[PDB]
Design a protein around this motif. Structure first.
Motif, PDB file in Angstrom:
ATOM      1  N   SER A 284      29.963  23.126  21.718  1.00 12.65           N
ATOM      2  CA  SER A 284      29.857  23.382  23.154  1.00 12.65           C
ATOM      3  C   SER A 284      30.351  24.771  23.536  1.00 12.65           C
ATOM      4  O   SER A 284      30.994  24.939  24.575  1.00 12.65           O
ATOM      5  N   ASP A 285      30.068  25.786  22.721  1.00 11.40           N
ATOM      6  CA  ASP A 285      30.628  27.115  22.938  1.00 11.40           C
ATOM      7  C   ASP A 285      29.806  27.960  23.903  1.00 11.40           C
ATOM      8  O   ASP A 285      30.364  28.582  24.810  1.00 11.40           O
ATOM      9  N   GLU A 286      28.487  28.012  23.713  1.00  8.56           N
ATOM     10  CA  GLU A 286      27.657  28.895  24.528  1.00  8.56           C
ATOM     11  C   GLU A 286      27.699  28.494  25.996  1.00  8.56           C
ATOM     12  O   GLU A 286      27.853  29.343  26.883  1.00  8.56           O
ATOM     13  N   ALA A 287      27.576  27.194  26.271  1.00 12.68           N
ATOM     14  CA  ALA A 287      27.630  26.724  27.649  1.00 12.68           C
ATOM     15  C   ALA A 287      28.988  27.009  28.272  1.00 12.68           C
ATOM     16  O   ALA A 287      29.072  27.389  29.444  1.00 12.68           O
ATOM     17  N   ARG A 288      30.063  26.835  27.502  1.00 13.96           N
ATOM     18  CA  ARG A 288      31.401  27.095  28.024  1.00 13.96           C
ATOM     19  C   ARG A 288      31.575  28.561  28.393  1.00 13.96           C
ATOM     20  O   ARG A 288      32.114  28.886  29.456  1.00 13.96           O
ATOM     21  N   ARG A 289      31.128  29.467  27.522  1.00 19.00           N
ATOM     22  CA  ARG A 289      31.271  30.889  27.813  1.00 19.00           C
ATOM     23  C   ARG A 289      30.413  31.299  29.002  1.00 19.00           C
ATOM     24  O   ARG A 289      30.850  32.089  29.845  1.00 19.00           O
ATOM     25  N   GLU A 290      29.193  30.762  29.097  1.00 24.39           N
ATOM     26  CA  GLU A 290      28.353  31.074  30.251  1.00 24.39           C
ATOM     27  C   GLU A 290      28.967  30.546  31.542  1.00 24.39           C
ATOM     28  O   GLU A 290      28.916  31.215  32.581  1.00 24.39           O
ATOM     29  N   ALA A 291      29.558  29.348  31.500  1.00 22.43           N
ATOM     30  CA  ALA A 291      30.195  28.797  32.691  1.00 22.43           C
ATOM     31  C   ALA A 291      31.417  29.610  33.094  1.00 22.43           C
ATOM     32  O   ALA A 291      31.653  29.831  34.287  1.00 22.43           O
TER      33      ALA A 291
ATOM     34  N   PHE B  73      32.293  35.559  37.832  1.00 21.03           N
ATOM     35  CA  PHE B  73      31.365  36.283  38.695  1.00 21.03           C
ATOM     36  C   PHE B  73      31.478  35.825  40.140  1.00 21.03           C
ATOM     37  O   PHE B  73      31.434  36.645  41.065  1.00 21.03           O
ATOM     38  N   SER B  74      31.616  34.524  40.360  1.00 17.63           N
ATOM     39  CA  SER B  74      31.659  33.983  41.709  1.00 17.63           C
ATOM     40  C   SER B  74      33.065  33.907  42.290  1.00 17.63           C
ATOM     41  O   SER B  74      33.210  33.587  43.473  1.00 17.63           O
TER      42      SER B  74
ATOM     43  N   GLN C  61      32.021  40.799  40.661  1.00 19.98           N
ATOM     44  CA  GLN C  61      30.696  40.897  40.070  1.00 19.98           C
ATOM     45  C   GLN C  61      30.527  42.154  39.228  1.00 19.98           C
ATOM     46  O   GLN C  61      29.428  42.408  38.726  1.00 19.98           O
ATOM     47  N   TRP C  62      31.586  42.940  39.063  1.00 22.08           N
ATOM     48  CA  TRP C  62      31.571  44.166  38.271  1.00 22.08           C
ATOM     49  C   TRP C  62      32.537  43.978  37.108  1.00 22.08           C
ATOM     50  O   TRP C  62      33.744  44.179  37.255  1.00 22.08           O
ATOM     51  N   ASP C  63      32.007  43.593  35.951  1.00 23.02           N
ATOM     52  CA  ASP C  63      32.844  43.391  34.776  1.00 23.02           C
ATOM     53  C   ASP C  63      32.431  44.298  33.621  1.00 23.02           C
ATOM     54  O   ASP C  63      32.345  43.861  32.470  1.00 23.02           O
TER      55      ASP C  63
ATOM     56  N   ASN D  67      31.811  32.791  32.521  1.00 25.17           N
ATOM     57  CA  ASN D  67      31.261  34.010  33.101  1.00 25.17           C
ATOM     58  C   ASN D  67      30.799  33.779  34.533  1.00 25.17           C
ATOM     59  O   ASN D  67      31.034  34.617  35.409  1.00 25.17           O
ATOM     60  N   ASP D  68      30.142  32.645  34.789  1.00 22.84           N
ATOM     61  CA  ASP D  68      29.706  32.328  36.147  1.00 22.84           C
ATOM     62  C   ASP D  68      30.893  32.183  37.086  1.00 22.84           C
ATOM     63  O   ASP D  68      30.862  32.665  38.225  1.00 22.84           O
TER      64      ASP D  68
END
Lengths: 541, 421, 49, 45, 53
Positions: free
Chosen positions: D18-25, D31-32, D36-38, D27-28
């Motif tokens: 469950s790594d890719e989904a965790r990292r994308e979440a 971002f929110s 939004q500037w990383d 990041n989201d």
């Protein structure tokens, strides 16, 4: 002659027949769930801007919400000439073992995959429950199937939307190491012999899925005439018929309890066998499972046959080209915006030689000074000042961004409304009801109603095991589609309210109001009010 | 130019021998460590003695074995190009023809192995259409020799003709000037019968090899030779390694002109009734498996002698030849003329050991692998596809692994009509 | 250490949840808007420059 | 055989699955919630 | 590619895999990228017993 050879040949034939639609559906699923830049060659070449300006996902979300707001569930109705309440027990069982979260989750997954890819599926299984059994120390539960397009392979020689005429179906199970260990423990397999089965991945999928184990379940349906015994019920009546397979044991317990054989006939029926297989050996060969049908329910979107070839489509397939064009054009425009020199003057070095600090951008001077003379040309040549042109978005780029967006908007309109998809879901639920009825007749204890009470006539063997006894007057109720109700109490409340909505304000209205109060839930004040309604009904007789 | 998609069918093959051969699939995990070979036992035979006092005459126990191994994959590696159109319209047809050619290769390998390791040899001094009932005589000779040798035939027998001999048999049946049922069927159709002279499956196979004649002449055995049955033997490190029972290496005068598949018979040796150990009236026949060196040859029926005084009784219980080699016996070559060979056997004599190729694994990421079943023959291989870099093209491989084995070379046979002069 | 109940006492809530190929993916609302929002921020920064 | 080894093997399997989904979440969420500037590297250079 | 957690230490690396169609072979690669930094060398010390001539 080899069982594995025959199984693998049938599986290969079906896979090759269904390869095209499966590839299209997998591409649609990747497009709608991972990314719309489904390019596997991008990782090699140099990097350019690739945006994702979605215009299809809101439509998918809207359709999913629309299909979620209108739940559909089975509704068993008595046949013509049968007893008026011949479906109450079956309805109670169905609601009791389908009110759980797993059934709703599986149906929602299947519907979402139907909308996005074009096909989805779910499964029905039976398990031994000792704490809260539905009937006969057993429960029936509906489990989900993820990526049914690639994980459920049907018989290729089937020409029905619900695949009711298909005789075999292989389902590819993928599980972790712990999942395989527990699966082997449950099915009495060997956990040390790691099994493997085919499960190809798209060239564009970048992730590995480390440490997974794949197997297949091969379901086959065989229709044959088997021997059936005719007994005489000592409790009431006379004609009762049972199958020799069902009464292989307790064949003398019936005589001991008081059943006397009358005759012996041969009745044709269907039997379903499951086989657990890998690419090398057959782990489980012919495990006979409960029911007259394959327990797998497929749900389709736009389904048909073109040239003896199955095609199913959802809502994403026809918008893919327009969406890709829109993404490409927007990426081009962003590249134009970013990598383009801005509007600055063109200067000869001698024109501003010595005045270069005036044009840097400060506002400490009232004007800009230019050199005039050259020691060899006398005076600098007169040429109007030139400026680099501003970046622009080409007319072609704007026109086709607009055209691609408009085309996707035109083509991503299911129906006018999702009535066709809801009808397909209703067909799937009717097939689910059929399979569930067969499994209930096979394993549950269905009482028979007499007009003289529910007479549950069962018996136990010498090994303390209880064997069900079901007469051949079992298919007394057919299947239709109705609203999703958690229990028949809620169903009765809804029916009473529906009748109240049309009954004018008279004595039937008073009767229906009292009935609605009677069928209410319990608290303290509502308990008192229901007691009052009960007393009023009893007094009115 | 208006190229169409109407295909002109040109070829159509049959694989009766490959269909009939039994398929064996030993466990892959064990086979990988065992180096693609597995040993299986042979029906034990017990010696017997006569008399009342048997002091110090108690025999030991001997149980022999055979080994089955595999070959190398038979691929159809070919390259795609997605920017053409002739390479698009023909890819599916290439896949289908690849499956058909793989089936063809399997059947050809089965036929060649049978025709080259068939110990039993039935030869005729003339063709089949020469006299009357010669096809039936040819089949009945094989049936009678397999009956006399007391070979196990529970799983069934089989006789495969070549098409020319099938036509000759049909012609012999149709020149009968009478018409009942067998001549009527042999006239209306080409079939002679389904069963002839005891065999329960008489077929015609168009893909049977031609046994070229042997240029060998004047070869005699050099030195008395005795080949004792044995189950294992000690190597240089003292380990006991198994011994195959279907091979014996003999030292001849000169192996000039000999080749794999030559049929020979030593002058003086005879067959035995196997179980009863009764001497037969037919000379023993052997098939050379490999021409090792220039003075040795490996023959497939191990010639155990009944009168060999160097054999313990438990080894003498496996005798199949009435006498041993005697330093001067001339070896008669049975294949003196070129002739396409009819092949007969018992249905449990030839098997096809098959192993999977686990290319569906995680280690082969980036390539897409699928199961791929050959029709007719009962085999399953892999179908793998990969894409090239920075171009719309790729590579596709149809791989499949098998090895054909003859577990009972004495049960297979060969038919050689017209072996005169 | 044995705890009360029959189930794991953790309750999850999901938004847009699914499986692609043996891989779970969940998305809320911000994932799809990130590209457009980042582009808008960059363009406005360029205009400010 | 070790209890710690078994527990850590199960946890490792889940963590890598469950790594890719965790990292994308994550990041989201950043971002929110934060900015939004990383760029980081492009910010400090 | 996929994640690959290293035991004992709290580090993660990349486990990558590739296959070859021509030669039916595969390559696996476990890569781990890390850097040890001594931000306070004046705090890090060393003890040397038996430093006699």
């Amino acid at each position: 002659e080899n069982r594995l050879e025959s199984i693998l040949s049938r599986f290969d034939a079906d896979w090759t027949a269904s390869d095209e639609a499966r590839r299209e559906a997998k591409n649609d699923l990747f497009f709608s769930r991972v990314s719309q830049w489904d390019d596997w060659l991008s990782q090699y070449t140099t990097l350019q801007y690739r945006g994702q300006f979605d215009v299809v996902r809101p439509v998918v979300r809207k359709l999913v919400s629309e299909m979620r707001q209108n739940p559909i569930d089975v509704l068993y109705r008595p046949k013509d000439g049968a007893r008026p309440d011949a479906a109450d027990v079956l309805m109670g069982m169905y609601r009791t073992d389908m009110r759980h979260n797993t059934a709703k989750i599986a149906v929602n997954i299947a519907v979402r995959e139907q909308i996005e890819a074009g096909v989805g599926a779910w499964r029905l299984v039976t398990d031994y429950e000792d704490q809260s059994p539905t009937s006969n120390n057993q429960v029936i539960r509906r489990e989900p199937i993820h990526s049914a397009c690639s994980h459920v392979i049907w018989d290729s020689n089937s020409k029905l939307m619900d695949k009711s005429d298909a005789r075999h179906c292989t389902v590819i199970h993928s599980m972790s190491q712990n999942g395989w260990e527990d699966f082997a423990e449950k099915y009495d397999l060997d956990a040390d012999d790691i099994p493997s089965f085919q499960n190809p991945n798209d060239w564009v999928f970048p992730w590995l899925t480390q440490d997974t184990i794949q197997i297949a379940e091969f379901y086959e349906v065989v229709e044959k005439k088997e021997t059936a015994f005719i007994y005489q019920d000592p409790v009431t009546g006379e004609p009762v018929s049972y199958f020799k397979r069902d009464i292989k044991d307790v064949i003398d317990d019936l005589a001991d309890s008081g059943f006397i054989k009358i005759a012996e006939r041969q009745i044709k029926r269907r039997r379903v066998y499951k086989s657990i297989i890998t690419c090398t050996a057959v782990l489980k060969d012919k495990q006979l499972i409960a029911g007259e049908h394959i327990p797998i329910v497929p749900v389709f979107g736009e389904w048909g046959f073109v040239e003896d070839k199955e095609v199913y489509e959802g809502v994403v397939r026809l918008t893919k080209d327009g969406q890709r064009l829109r993404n490409m054009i927007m990426s081009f425009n962003a590249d134009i915006v970013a990598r383009t020199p801005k509007k600055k003057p063109f200067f000869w070095p001698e024109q501003i030689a010595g005045f270069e600090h005036m044009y840097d951008g400060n506002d400490d001077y009232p004007y800009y000074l230019l050199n005039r003379t050259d020691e060899n040309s006398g005076d600098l040549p007169t040429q109007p000042l030139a400026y680099y042109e501003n970046p622009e978005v080409p007319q072609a780029n704007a026109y086709m961004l607009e055209a691609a967006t408009s085309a996707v908007k035109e083509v991503a309109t299911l129906g006018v409304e999702t009535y066709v998809f809801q009808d397909n879901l209703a067909t799937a639920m009717r097939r689910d009801g059929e399979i569930y009825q067969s499994i209930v007749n096979d394993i549950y204890d269905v009482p028979r109603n007499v007009t003289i009470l529910m007479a549950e006539v069962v018996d136990l063997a010498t090994g303390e095991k209880q064997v069900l006894n079901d007469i051949r007057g079992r298919y007394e109720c057919y299947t239709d589609v109705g609203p999703s109700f958690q229990s028949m109490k809620q169903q009765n409340r809804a029916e009473i309210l529906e009748l109240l909505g049309k009954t004018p304000q008279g004595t039937p209205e008073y009767q229906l109001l009292l009935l609605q109060y009677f069928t209410l839930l319990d608290g303290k004040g509502v308990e008192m009010m229901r007691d009052y309604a009960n007393k009023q009904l009893i007094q009115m007789g | 130019t208006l190229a169409v998609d109407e295909i002109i069918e040109t070829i159509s093959a049959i694989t009766p021998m490959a269909q009939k051969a039994k398929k064996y699939t030993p466990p892959a995990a064990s086979m990988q460590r065992s180096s693609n070979t597995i040993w299986m036992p042979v029906e034990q035979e017990s010696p017997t003695q006569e008399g009342w006092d048997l002091t110090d005459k108690a025999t030991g126990l001997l149980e022999l074995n055979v080994a089955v191994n595999m070959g190398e994959p038979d691929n159809d590696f070919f390259q795609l190009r997605a920017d053409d159109l002739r390479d698009e319209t023909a890819y599916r047809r290439r896949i289908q023809s690849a499956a058909r050619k793989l089936a063809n290769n399997v059947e050809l390998k089965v036929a060649n192995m049978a025709a080259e390791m068939g110990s039993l040899v039935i030869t005729s001094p003339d063709a089949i259409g020469t006299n009357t009932a010669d096809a039936w005589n040819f089949v009945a000779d094989a049936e009678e020799i397999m009956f006399s040798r007391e070979l196990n035939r529970d799983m069934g027998t089989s006789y495969f003709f070549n098409p020319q001999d099938y036509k000759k048999a049909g012609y012999d049946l149709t020149k009968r000037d009478i018409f009942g049922r067998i001549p009527e069927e042999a006239y209306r159709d080409g079939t002679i019968q389904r069963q002839v002279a005891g065999f329960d499956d008489v077929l015609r196979s168009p893909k049977l090899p031609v046994l070229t004649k042997s240029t060998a002449t004047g070869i005699t055995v050099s030195g008395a030779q005795s080949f004792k049955p044995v189950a294992w033997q000690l190597d240089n490190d003292g380990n006991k390694v198994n011994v195959d029972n279907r091979f014996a290496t003999v030292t001849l005068s000169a192996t000039t002109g000999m080749k794999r598949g030559d049929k020979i018979s030593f002058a003086g040796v005879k067959f035995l009734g196997q179980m009863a150990k009764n001497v037969l009236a037919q000379d023993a026949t052997f098939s050379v498996v490999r021409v090792v060196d220039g003075t040795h040859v490996e023959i497939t029926p191990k010639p155990v002698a009944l009168d060999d005084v160097s054999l313990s009784p438990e080894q003498r219980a496996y005798a199949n030849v009435n006498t041993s080699l005697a330093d001067a016996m001339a070896v008669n070559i049975l294949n003196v003329k070129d002739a396409r060979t009819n092949v007969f056997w018992a249905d449990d004599a030839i098997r096809i050991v098959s192993q999977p190729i686990p290319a569906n694994h995680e280690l082969f990421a980036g390539m897409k692998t699928t199961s791929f079943s050959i029709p007719d023959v009962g085999l399953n291989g892999i179908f793998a596809t990969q894409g090239d870099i920075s171009t719309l093209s790729g590579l596709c491989r149809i791989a499949l692994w098998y090895g054909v084995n003859a577990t009972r070379p004495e049960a297979i046979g060969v038919g050689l009509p017209g072996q005169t002069a």
